[PDB]
């Protein structure tokens, strides 16, 4: 499918240096297209000066700098009609165009269990290469979920549409399992040690 873009509105004109100006056109999806919110943010340097929210239907000044611009854009009903249409021709169109490989993207985790120590004090469960980032990684000792001695890093972004996480069990007939549940998997992975 052919993705659509959103135009930026143009604000009215009223030794080393650095200047930055940007715009972010956001589509917020809850239960897919059932609830859709368009937000367009206008930023100068490190501050947002104005936005449009489709739930509001008008520009809102976020700083004194944007106050003149919100009122200038808010005085033009055709301009406001244009922004309100972005919910359909930008947000809904693009959702239909990319849902198959974004919302429905599925990449299976790889699970490795290691000793860390010199005697063993800790078991590492390394889980790598997965998408989406939501994942459950649990340690079992003889079929009983451990929690007390369990330390989890945050799920880390690899930046290439994959994620990783590390779950360490502090511990000393013992059967340890790292169990991984993920949307890519029909069945959880039980990595024994």
């Amino acid at each position: 499918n052919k993705m659509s873009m959103s135009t930026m509105n143009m604000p009215m004109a009223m030794s080393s240096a650095f200047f930055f100006c940007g715009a972010i056109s956001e589509c917020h999806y809850l239960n897919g297209t059932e609830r859709v919110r368009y937000l367009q943010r206008y930023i100068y340097n490190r501050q947002q000066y104005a936005h449009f929210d489709s739930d509001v239907g008008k520009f809102v000044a976020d700083s004194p700098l944007g106050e003149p611009q919100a009122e200038y854009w808010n005085s033009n009903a055709e301009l406001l009609e244009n922004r309100m249409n972005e919910v359909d021709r930008f947000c809904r169109h693009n959702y239909g165009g990319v849902e198959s490989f974004t919302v429905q993207r599925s990449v299976e985790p790889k699970v490795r269990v290691s000793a860390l120590q010199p005697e063993t004090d800790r078991l590492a469960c390394y889980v790598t290469g997965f998408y989406p980032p939501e994942i459950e990684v649990k340690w079992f000792l003889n079929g009983r979920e451990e929690t007390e001695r369990v330390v989890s890093t945050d799920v880390m972004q690899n930046g290439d549409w994959t994620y990783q996480v590390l779950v360490v069990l502090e511990t000393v007939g013992d059967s340890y399992v790292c169990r991984v549940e993920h949307a890519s998997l029909r069945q959880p992975i039980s990595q024994a040690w």
């Binding site: 604000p11 897919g32 100068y44």
Partner: protein, 183 residues
């Protein structure tokens, strides 16, 4: 439950020295779908599979860039050339996969929480520059209006090798760097 698709574009310039930059890209959740190479008018998909599933007319981004650059000059004036303090990056260096001696892997260098979005990454193996097969991302936004950037170095883990990632942020006194070595 919840998803965000963003079109994020920025236009920036320095004086002393004089330089200009621009970026136009689409993002889904924390990850990049594509950016447009503005000099060549080409849509560059983050993963080649995206480019087989979908398309984007990059000429549209170039039209936005002309508007962006004009917006920049108008907002510089409306603000009486007000400027913000720079924020220098935090660096993390970590492997993509489980490290096994002699198994090809990828080192990730993540520069985070910096502004403005102008930073270069240089990789070193045992203190020598390595550049073959390196991928650098474009600048990804944050809620706090700071930026982050990824670099990737293909490598083969060996006992006693040390790696370093150094970031040069615009206007900093020098590079900040982090080292990594295998287990």
């Amino acid at each position: 439950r919840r998803h965000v698709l963003l079109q994020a574009e920025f236009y920036q310039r320095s004086e002393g020295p004089d330089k200009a930059w621009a970026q136009f890209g689409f993002h889904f959740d924390a990850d990049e779908l594509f950016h447009v190479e503005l000099d060549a008018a080409q849509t560059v998909w983050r993963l080649p599979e995206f480019g087989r599933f979908a398309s984007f007319e990059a000429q549209g981004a170039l039209q936005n860039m002309a508007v962006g650059k004009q917006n920049l000059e108008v907002m510089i004036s409306n603000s009486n050339r007000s400027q913000q303090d720079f924020v220098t990056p935090e660096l993390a260096l970590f492997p993509a996969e489980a490290v096994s001696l002699e198994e090809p892997n990828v080192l990730i260098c993540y520069a985070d929480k910096f502004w403005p979005p102008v930073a270069t990454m240089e990789w070193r193996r045992n203190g020598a520059v390595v550049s073959e097969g390196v991928y650098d991302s474009v600048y990804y936004g944050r809620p706090d209006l700071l930026f982050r950037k990824f670099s990737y170095l293909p490598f083969v883990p060996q006992r006693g090798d040390v790696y370093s990632c150094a970031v040069r942020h615009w206007g900093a006194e020098g590079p900040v760097q982090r080292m990594w070595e295998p287990e």
